[PDB]
Amino acid sequence: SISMTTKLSYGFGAFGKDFAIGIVYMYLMYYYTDVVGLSVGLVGTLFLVARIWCAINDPIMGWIVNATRSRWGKFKPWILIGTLTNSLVLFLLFSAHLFEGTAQVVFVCVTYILWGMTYTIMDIPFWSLVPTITLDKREREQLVPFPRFFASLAGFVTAGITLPFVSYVGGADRGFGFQMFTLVLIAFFIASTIVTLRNVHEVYSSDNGVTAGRPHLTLKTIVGLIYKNDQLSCLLGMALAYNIASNIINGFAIYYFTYVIGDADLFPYYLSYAGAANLLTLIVFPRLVKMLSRRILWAGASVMPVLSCAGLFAMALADIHNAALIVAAGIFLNIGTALFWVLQVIMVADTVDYGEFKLNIRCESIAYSVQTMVVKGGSAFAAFFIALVLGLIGYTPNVAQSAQTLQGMQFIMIVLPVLFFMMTLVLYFRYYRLNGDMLRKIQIHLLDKYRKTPP
């Protein structure tokens, strides 16, 4: 029933959506420090505060999107505004190398936080289009792999050709090449936004006379829809734990690839094989959901990175530091993250549907606001837990540290993501219920309701 054109246009939309932020996530540290000359402490504090601010802003953006009424619906206008304003703020962000002194710092602080906010404006409604397109289990399963694959491909093409571009254009003057590549990103992002706005046509969307929308809602009642929707709360917990675990693992990988190994011959192969695994598991997700249960795929999504953690734990117990083990851990982690993200989008859709069922309110913006809130709070809480463990083990900041202290810090860093994954799976298998006959019950209920309600 889903137009192949719709799948591919939403995929290109996701490509442009993530191709504009991968550069930030991946090289804003290197820009701010190696090009602009700012203290690592300042940059880290800014990143933490901004992630907290975005997490708090997310539900406000959900309230805004839900209470919106326009010609193109309640999502497309905010999608366009977000893309445009975020492109502007991105270019301004990577133009920080011009100023100096307090003028620079202030600039850097404004742009960055604005960027965050702006992207939030763009992010929530985009994904909220998913539950308004299908409403069916298999259709969602074979829909969301397109955008997830395209997001991952954007991230990996960034990691691949973002530095060669900055080097070719400008040369020496790294800020200039950065802003030129930024313009490239702006072009792709706006093209993708136009594509998704024209082609993606929301079907079962709030705004429709039959879809049980309640636009005039308070912030109190809307944020209460999160707690009242017990399944959306389960999703909140699951995704928060999974994001904390994956952020801790990614920070460990960054630390051991940037500072420790020093063998620059490895990271290319690690990235290549990780991207291969991720894109392959995304391509083959429509298959294997029928071959293997939805629950089974969630379990595997969290278990594969647990295998990666165990492998690198064995690696740390010795000092072999085998590159084969590194690439295997990366492959497993990437398979897990792909499965997780696909199932997570499908589950946000399922949860907005279950909210319309249990309650009588349809609200996609809030569920995907929860998604983005959790995406940001994951990094926030991972940093919090790492600082907690450091203070507990007595990690003086960048001063001489015992050998066993460092090895134990590494071991506990390996361990606690396993705890978070066990938490995700406990919560899933004990409280989640949207994978079987329940899903079809919700579907038939909503479809019959729409059929009976006067349009």
Author numbering: 2 to 456
Tell me, in the authors' exact words, what the paper reports.
The melibiose permease of Salmonella enterica serovar Typhimurium (MelBSt), a member of MFS transporters, catalyzes the symport of a galactopyranoside with either of H+, Li+, or Na+, which makes MelB as a unique system for studying cation-coupled transport mechanisms. The Na+ binding involves two negatively charged residues, Asp55 and Asp59 (helix II), and two polar residues, Asn58 (helix II) and Thr121 (helix IV).
D55C MelBSt also loses the binding affinity with Na+ or Li+ and is unable to mediate Na+- or Li+-coupled melibiose active transport. Different from the D59C mutant, the D55C mutant retains the H+-coupled melibiose active transport activity, which excludes the role of Asp55 in the H+ binding. Here we report the structures of apo D59C and DDMB-bound D55C MelBSt mutants, which were determined by molecular replacement, modeled from positions 2 to 454 or 2 to 256 without a gap, refined to a resolution of 3.0 Å and 3.18 Å, respectively. In the D55C structure, the galactosyl moiety of bound DDMB exhibits a similar pose to that in the D59C bound with either DDMB or α-NPG. The densities of the 11-carbon tail were disordered and only 2 carbons were modeled. The glucosyl moiety pose is different from that in the D59C structure. The Na+-binding pocket in both crystal structures is nearly identical to the previously published D59C structures, with a Cys present at positions of either Asp55 or Asp59, respectively. In comparison with the Na+-bound WT MelBSt cryoEM structure, both the DDMB-bound D55C and apo D59C MelBSt mutants exhibited loosely packed side chains in this cation-binding pocket due to the absence of Na+ (the D55C structure was removed for clarity).
